[PDB]
Structure formats: structure tokens, C-alpha cells
Write a protein that binds this ligand. Structure first.
Ligand SMILES: [Cl-]
Length: 101
């Protein structure tokens, strides 16, 4: 439930698993990498000609890359899953996010 999310953490008001169209319950790193590479290709700014559309592509690309960075790193993913599961533990979740970075 994205009402429990903080805009400044992780994928903001999207769930990073949803961003990459991967399933938390059927997760593995092979599937995650394939999903990232396909969506990164799709949203890459080289694929569009004009300056304004390239900015819009970069905007989305940033989210795709954040989702992959969060889920591919074992420690970040453990922190992320805890955050999803414990939205009321605000200080702890913020601390773990910023500590890792
Ligand atoms: Cl957001």
C-alpha cells in the first residue's frame, strides 16, 4: 500500500518490484536482471529523437535504475522488504536507507 510509502525513499510512491514487473514472492536475481535490462532499453533516451522526449525518457529511466539498484543489492533488498513490511517504523526505515548510501 503506497500510502505507507515515503516519496523520498527507494522508488518513491511506486513499489520497486512493480516498477520492474517482477514478483516479490517469485524473485530471483536472474529474472530481476532480465527485467531491468529490457525496461532500461525501452526507456533509454537514445531511443527518442527530440530533446524534450529524451528528458522524459531519462526521468523514467532513473526510476527503473533505482528499482534495480534497490533489489539487486542483497542488503538494500533486505532493508526494502523490511520497509514494505513495517511502514510504521519510520525512523528505522529512513535510517537504514540513508546508512547504506
Ligand atoms: Cl513518487
Amino acid at each position: 500500500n503506497a500510502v505507507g510509502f515515503a516519496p523520498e525513499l527507494y522508488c518513491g510512491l511506486e513499489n520497486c518490484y512493480d516498477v520492474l514487473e517482477v514478483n516479490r514472492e517469485e524473485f530471483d536475481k536472474q529474472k530481476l536482471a532480465k527485467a531491468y535490462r529490457a525496461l532500461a532499453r525501452k526507456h533509454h533516451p537514445d531511443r527518442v529523437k527530440n530533446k524534450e522526449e529524451k528528458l522524459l525518457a531519462e526521468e523514467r529511466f532513473r526510476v527503473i535504475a533505482t528499482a534495480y539498484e534497490t533489489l539487486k543489492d542483497d542488503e538494500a533488498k533486505t532493508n526494502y522488504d523490511y520497509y514494505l513490511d513495517h511502514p510504521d517504523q519510520r525512523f528505522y526505515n529512513y535510517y537504514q536507507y540513508y546508512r547504506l548510501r
